[PDB]
Amino acid sequence: GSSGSSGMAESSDKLYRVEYAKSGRASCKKCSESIPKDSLRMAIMVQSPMFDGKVPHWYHFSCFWKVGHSIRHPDVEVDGFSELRWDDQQKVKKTAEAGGSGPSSG
Numbered sequence: 001g002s003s004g005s006s007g008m009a010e011s012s013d014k015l016y017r018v019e020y021a022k023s024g025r026a027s028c029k030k031c032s033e034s035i036p037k038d039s040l041r042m043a044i045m046v047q048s049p050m051f052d053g054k055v056p057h058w059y060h061f062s063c064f065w066k067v068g069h070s071i072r073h074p075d076v077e078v079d080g081f082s083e084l085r086w087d088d089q090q091k092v093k094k095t096a097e098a099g100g101s102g103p104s105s106g
């Protein structure tokens with residue numbers, strides 16, 4: 001029964017938000033695992049039927065792509081991107097273009 005503290009201002013209500021995990025609590029809705037701390041993870045804003053509202057869905061660097069969430073310009077569409085370092089920025093780009101980790105099985 002947390003109390004909570006209001007007072008959050010956001011200029012860009014970006015749907016996605018990528019940032020280095022803060023703790024190992026955030027769960028994943030793709031592999032049903034516990035996202036590791038200090039790991040590159042993404043977020044998705046979806047409307048929950050039970051929460052009758054929008055909730056931040058965290059998805060592993062790959063999981064996010066597994067579901068099938070392609071991104072053309074993750075530099076503006078996806079938040080944090082700009083915050084991320086040069087390396088990461090480029091990495092995310094290479095992936096986004098591919099549109100998937102690689103189901104290459106067998």
Ligand SMILES: [Zn+2]
Nearest residue numbers: 028031060063
């Ligand atoms: Zn996952």
